Structure formats: structure tokens, C-alpha cells
């Protein structure tokens, strides 16, 4: 039937509510998709379907007709945006939201930020992520601190990594950025989609996808300490019809460092294909690979803190405790297939399979122990660790809208499964060779390579992980939105050690967001995560500790300007942990139970702090990424933990694009500051606890770029401009590690 209409120009949402009255139809729409837009004038006797299209002219909004009601939708990739701020995030719940819509701490490092500052691996990225502190273990191993906790949760297009034991590092901590669009760090307790994991944060990595128009580049680089780099990216349609699309990228890097007899070379490959089956169904298959091959790898720091009889060691930044032949090899490869379908009711389901391999081949050799000796001699501890993890993952989810009280809401319902298997060899039963070296001062890593002998310990671990989850976002007011969600998990691990089993574990997700303006919004959330304890963490009665669990209490205010080209946020958080594995010196002074010698205690801990950050456009061609974070974490006795992670930290990185005849020049820079940190260490020769402190220090970088030809560009990066001599690790096995001296890296990019 034809109906008579009269609706003048007004704020879109009011005109939709009045359309329903003037057409006898129910109208379902998301207020946030509509607050920005505005309704065009309609007048006349028209058909409902024709009248609604005329009303929504110049907005690009979809209308889907079903029954006696109609639904309205007004709808990510960071590559080639020029922005340091994200568009949309589906990391938290799977629901595709804006930063301001999300009731959590979340920080995104964009393709542009990565290109601009020449961040080539995950380490460089973290060293530029506002609320994060990067400390070292040894040359080919680092630690990322967040809110008083180490980060053990690494995801790759949503699929969690099961190679979690950092004692056997196998790639997670040095992934090359050539194959990714962006890297998002979701802070707090992220159990909802991660499942079983740790507290602090979660690192999610999004892979590059094929374009529908041809696009490709070649970038060559050179830096300090014989540091070469090469990468090639090729993308676009592969059939005339364009029902298929592909993307292939290869990168190779070889380098040295300020440290002696040390080099690393990395090789990466990646290829992805897209298939259009019907107009609403798409298949994706892809494969990747990386290989980290070092020589002259260090172990447990760079040098010992004390000599033969205590005192204090003094050595140049170039000193490396590792032998020539020492190497910590780490290789990764993936094969995956995705499949998404769009259903008739605005609903969309996705199925992703994953097959991942994390391996290591680490013949190690370094000076460790209280050295040198009074005759300038020292000893080397030499061990060998080889292994491999094969991990198969299935995850499926459906997401779409639903009505309740004349309001449009959206739901997510999913299920996941994971089967992984970790096999490993360890050699320390050496067929007696000479440990000693003559010279400590003039150590150039020169010592023989031993016969490793037969394996000392075998590892053979099978892990099943099941998951089932649901999350809802209620549209109870225009200004107010309530999240109710949760996830149930089944964690089981079989192997040589006794079976670990947790059935029917539950993880809640509770969140609310209220709107004050068209600018500021307040939010609160309650989140949780747990991780089953490892075999050797046992109490006095030889019983296993209950899983390490924690909750994140967050409240704060977020901002948004220039319709999403700029975001501000200020939040206050509080993390309560239970079942933290600690010493128990009461038992360890005088053991009782013959079945265990070293026992543990499960205690509680509590981080309380706040955070302020900003990202995006500050002016037309002026981009920023900056944050301030304050934290203090305590035991249950009342003592500070993670004292090596600073209590106050400030990060700031900016770039300006010039105007006028010189719009071919770009100038940038960075400034990183952190407050004092310390570690309590034990002096063994002199039988005392000693305090080691690092003062507050600055870290400045500068950047300049020119768009030469039209296709050809060149850039320069200078890291640690002021050549600050500082430490990145102390208490780790009574060792120490310096931070990077002055840096340069030059680049040239072509763009086909």
C-alpha cells in the first residue's frame, strides 16, 4: 500500500522514530551509527520501500526488509591511513566497535606508526607502546611488563599461542612486522576470548589481506653494526573476473650489534589467497613462516654482577658472555583456512581453522656464576635444548542483531577447541669437557663445542583446550549501553607429569558505557582470567596449587574528536590476584616431606594504578601516540613485587607533515621516560642481600623523510640520540644487560 508522508530535515534518529508512526512499521537502529548522520526531507504519497530509500539518501545506509519491520545499518584496516589511531576493534568481544564504545584499556600500534618509525619486529613495537616496559633476559629473549605482570598471551588473528614456557622461547618474542597490518594490546584480564591465559595484557596480531586493486612495494634498509634489511610485498586480483585475490610477501634481514661476536639473520615468507564462492560467501587459505638464526647467543644476561669474591664488576657495553658457537634458534610457521558467510538477517558467521608450529634448536654456551677469578679466569655452563610444538585450533562464531523492547541489540555466540603437542629434548649430562677459559677481560667468545651426550630430560606434553562463549550488548538508552557476557572452559593436559584437569571453569564479562556528550563517555568493567599451574609448583603436602587467577576492576572516561580521527582516555584500574606461586622459606629452611624439597605457597597480590593516553590527529597533518601510566603492585604480606617495572612511566611519539611547496617532507621524533626501578639481589660470596637501582632516564629518537620521485622515498631514523648508557635487566640470575647505544637506520621504498 501507498502511504502519505511528511518528514522535514532533523537529526536522523528522530526521523526514524517518526517514520515508524507515519508508515505503521517498527524501526530498529543503532543510535551510535545514527547520532552523526542527519535526515533529508521527504514529502508526498509514496511506497514505504521507496520512501525509506529517499529519506536515507547521501548516507550509504543499508536497509533490510523482514516481516512488518525494517533494520538500518550504517557500515578497520590501518594500512595507508596516515593515522596513529585505529578505526574499529573486534579483539575484545568479536563485536566490531570504536575505541570509545569499548569498556576496556586497549592500545593499537598502526601500520603507519610502524612504517614511520621503522619498527620491524615485535620488540621494536613494544619499545614504542605507551604503557609497556621492555626488559631483557638475554640477547634473543625479552620481557614485556604490563600492570605488574609479564605478558604470556600472544594471539595471531584471534588464535592464542600455546607455546607459553619462556624457558623454551620459540618465536613469540621476535615476530617480524612485514606480514601484519597492526598490533593491538588489550590490557587487563582478557579471559573472554583468550580463554586460559595470564594477567597484565594480551598481544593480538592482525595479518595483511589481499587488495582488490594492484598494490606493491620494495623496501631496502641499512643501519648501525652492519645491519641490512630487504622486503617485498605484492597484492591484487588474480582472475579477470576478480573472484580470486592474493598477496605474497618475503623479507630477509642480516645484522650484528654493539655486542661482540654476535649476529642474527631472519628469513620470513607469507602467502594468502581469497576465493569468492557466491556473493555472500568467502574462503581464505594462507601460509606463513619465519626463522630466527643467531650466532654468539648470550644466556642469563650479558655478564655476572659479582666476581669471585663479591665486589662489583665493570665492563664495556660491547661485552657478551656467550660463546661463538652458542645459538638460540627459534622458528615459526602457520597454515590456516578461514570461511565467512553473510546470512539473510544481517547475521554473519565465521569458521577459522589453524595449524601452527613453534620450534626451537638451542645449543647454548655462556659464562655464568660468580666470575671472573683473581687470576682473570672463568667458567662456562653449556647446555642444549631442542623441541617442537604442533598446535591445531578450531574456532567458530556467529554475530548479529536482536530486538527486545523496540530497541536494537547485538549478540555473539561461539565455541572453540584446541589440540596441541609439545615434544622436547634437554642435554646437560655432558661427556666431560673443559669448562674454563684463560681470559675474562679479553673474552671474544672463543671456546670449544662439547659432545652433548645422551638426553638428560624428555618432555612429551599433550594439551586439550575447549571453550564456549556468549556476549551481549544491551541498548537500554541512547546514552547507555550494558555488556553482559561470559565463557566456560575445559583445560586438560596429559603427559609424563601428573594430569592437570579443570572442568566447568567460568569467566564473566560485565561492562557498561554511559554517554555525557557527543565527545566524552564514562565506562566501567569487570573481567577475569585464569591459568592452570605448572607441574612443579606444589605445596608442602606435594599437592598442586590451584590455577593462578585474577580480576580487573576498571573505571574511567574516554574522549573522541573529529569523528574518530582523535581519541583520549583516562582510566583507573585495580587487579586482584589469587594463587600466586611464591617461596615459603618456612618449609625451605627445614624440609619435612621426603617427596618434595623445594615447595611453594599460593598467595594473593594487588595492583592499583591509573592510566592516561591519546592517539590520532592533533592538527591537519600532525599525528600523535602518547601515554602516561602509574602502578604499584603488592603481596599479601605487604611488599612490592615487580620492582624492576617502574612505578611511573611516560611515552610520547609524534610526526608532522609539511604544507605548501614542501609537502614532500616529513619530520618526526619520540621521547620515552620512566621512573626509578630496582631489584633486590643476593651476594653469594659475601652472604648478604644487596640493593641495585636504576635512576630515572630519558630515551629520545628523531626522524626525517622525503617523498623523492613520486614513487621513490627515503627516510632516516635515529634512536637513542643522546647515547644514554643505561641498564635493561639486573636481578635475573645475578646478571646484567645494557640498553641500545646510539642508532641509525636508513631506508628506501619504491611502490610499484
Amino acid at each position: 500500500q501507498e502511504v502519505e508522508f511528511d518528514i522535514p530535515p532533523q537529526a536522523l534518529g528522530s526521523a526514524l522514530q517518526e517514520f515508524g508512526r507515519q508508515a505503521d512499521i517498527q524501526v530498529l537502529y543503532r543510535p551510535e551509527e545514527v547520532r552523526n548522520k542527519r535526515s533529508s526531507a521527504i514529502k508526498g504519497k509514496l511506497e514505504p520501500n521507496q520512501a525509506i530509500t529517499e529519506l536515507l539518501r547521501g548516507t550509504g545506509a543499508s536497509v533490510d526488509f523482514q516481516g512488518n519491520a525494517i533494520t538500518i545499518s550504517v557500515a578497520t584496516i590501518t594500512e595507508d591511513s596516515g593515522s596513529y589511531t585505529p578505526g574499529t576493534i573486534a579483539t575484545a568481544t568479536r563485536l566490531v566497535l570504536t575505541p570509545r564504545e569499548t569498556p576496556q584499556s586497549i592500545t593499537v600500534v598502526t601500520r603507519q606508526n610502524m612504517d614511520d618509525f621503522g619498527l620491524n619486529n615485535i620488540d621494536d613495537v613494544m619499545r614504542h607502546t605507551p604503557g609497556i616496559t621492555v626488559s631483557a633476559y638475554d640477547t634473543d629473549r625479552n620481557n614485556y611488563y604490563a600492570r605488574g605482570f609479564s605478558i604470556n598471551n600472544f594471539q595471531y588473528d584471534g588464535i592464542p599461542s600455546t607455546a607459553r614456557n619462556v624457558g623454551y622461547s620459540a618465536g613469540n618474542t621476535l615476530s617480524d612486522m612485514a606480514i601484519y597490518d597492526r598490533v593491538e594490546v588489550l590490557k587487563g584480564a582478557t579471559g573472554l576470548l583468550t580463554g586460559a591465559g595470564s594477567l597484565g595484557a594480551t598481544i593480538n596480531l592482525i595479518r595483511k589481506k589481499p587488495t582488490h586493486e594492484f598494490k606493491g612495494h620494495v623496501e631496502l634498509g641499512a643501519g648501525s653494526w652492519d645491519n641490512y634489511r630487504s622486503e617485498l610485498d605484492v597484492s591484487g586480483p588474480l582472475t579477470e573476473s576478480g573472484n580470486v585475490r592474493g598477496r605474497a610477501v618475503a623479507a630477509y634481514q642480516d645484522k650484528h650489534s654493539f655486542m661482540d661476536h654476535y649476529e642474527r639473520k631472519t628469513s620470513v615468507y607469507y602467502g594468502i589467497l581469497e576465493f569468492d564462492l557466491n556473493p555472500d560467501t568467502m574462503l581464505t587459505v594462507g601460509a606463513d613462516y619465519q626463522d630466527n638464526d643467531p650466532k654468539g647467543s648470550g644466556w642469563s644476561g650479558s655478564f655476572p654482577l659479582f666476581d669471585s669474591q663479591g665486589n662489583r664488576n665493570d665492563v664495556s657495553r660491547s661485552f657478551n658472555n656467550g660463546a661463538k658457537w652458542s645459538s638460540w634458534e627459534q622458528y615459526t610457521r602457520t597454515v590456516f583456512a578461514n570461511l565467512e558467510h553473510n546470512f539473510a538477517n544481517g547475521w554473519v558467521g565465521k569458521v577459522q581453522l589453524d595449524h601452527k608450529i613453534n620450534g626451537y634448536h638451542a645449543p647454548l654456551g655462556a659464562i655464568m656464576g660468580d666470575w671472573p677469578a683473581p687470576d682473570n679466569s672463568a667458567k662456562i655452563v653449556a647446555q642444549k635444548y631442542t623441541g617442537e610444538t604442533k598446535s591445531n585450533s578450531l574456532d567458530i562464531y556467529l554475530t548479529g542483531p536482536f530486538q527486545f523492547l523496540g530497541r536494537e541489540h547485538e549478540l555473539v555466540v561461539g565455541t572453540s577447541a584446541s589440540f596441541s603437542h609439545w615434544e622436547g629434548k634437554s642435554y646437560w649430562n655432558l661427556r666431560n669437557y673443559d669448562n674454563t677459559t684463560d681470559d675474562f677481560i679479553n673474552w671474544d667468545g672463543d671456546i670449544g663445542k662439547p659432545d652433548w651426550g645422551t638426553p638428560s630430560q624428555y618432555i612429551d606434553d599433550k594439551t586439550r583446550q575447549l571453550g564456549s562463549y556468549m556476549t551481549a550488548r544491551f541498548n537500554v538508552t541512547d546514552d547507555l549501553n550494558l555488556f553482559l557476557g561470559g565463557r566456560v572452559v575445559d583445560y586438560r593436559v596429559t603427559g609424563l607429569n601428573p594430569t592437570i584437569r579443570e572442568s566447568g571453569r567460568f569467566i564473566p564479562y560485565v561492562g557498561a558505557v554511559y554517554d555525557l556528550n557527543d565527545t566524552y563517555s564514562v565506562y566501567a568493567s569487570y573481567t577475569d582470567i585464569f591459568m592452570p599451574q605448572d607441574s612443579w609448583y606444589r605445596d608442602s603436602s606435594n599437592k598442586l596449587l590451584e590455577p593462578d587467577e585474577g580480576q580487573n576492576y576498571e573505571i574511567g572516561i574516554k574522549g573522541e574528536y573529529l569523528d574518530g580521527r582523535l581519541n583520549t582516555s583516562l582510566a583507573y584500574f585495580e587487579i586482584h590476584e589469587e594463587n600466586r606461586a611464591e617461596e615459603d622459606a618456612l618449609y625451605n629452611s627445614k624440609p619435612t616431606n621426603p617427596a618434595i624439597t623445594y615447595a611453594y605457597k599460593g598467595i594473593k597480590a594487588k595492583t592499583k594504578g591509573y592510566e592516561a593516553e591519546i592517539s590520532g590527529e592533533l592538527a591537519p597533518g600532525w599525528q600523535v601516540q602518547a601515554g602516561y601510566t602509574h602502578k604499584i603492585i603488592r603481596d599479601d604480606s605487604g611488599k612490592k613485587v615487580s620492582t624492576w617495572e617502574p612505578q611511573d612511566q611516560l611515552s610520547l611519539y609524534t610526526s608532522y607533515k609539511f604544507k605548501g611547496a614542501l609537502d614532500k617532507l616529513t619530520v618526526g621524533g619520540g621521547a620515552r621516560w620512566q621512573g626509578k626501578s630496582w631489584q633486590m639481589v643476593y651476594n653469594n660470596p659475601r652472604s648478604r642481600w644487596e640493593k641495585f637501582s636504576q635512576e630515572d632516564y630519558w630515551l629520545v629518537d628523531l626522524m626525517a623523510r622525503y617523498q623523492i620521485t613520486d614513487k621513490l622515498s627515503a627516510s632516516v631514523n635515529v634512536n637513542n640520540v643522546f647515547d644514554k648508557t643505561y641498564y635493561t635487566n639486573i636481578g635475573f640470575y645475578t646478571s646484567a644487560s645494557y640498553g641500545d647505544p646510539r642508532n641509525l637506520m636508513f631506508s628506501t621504498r619504491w611502490d610499484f
Binding site: V166, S300, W428
Partner: peptide, 8 residues
């Protein structure tokens, strides 16, 4: 506490 035997 990763099950490795360094000096121990």
C-alpha cells in the same frame, strides 16, 4: 620456574 637445570 621453567624446569631447566642451569647451575643447579
Amino acid at each position: 620456574x621453567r624446569x631447566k637445570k642451569k647451575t643447579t
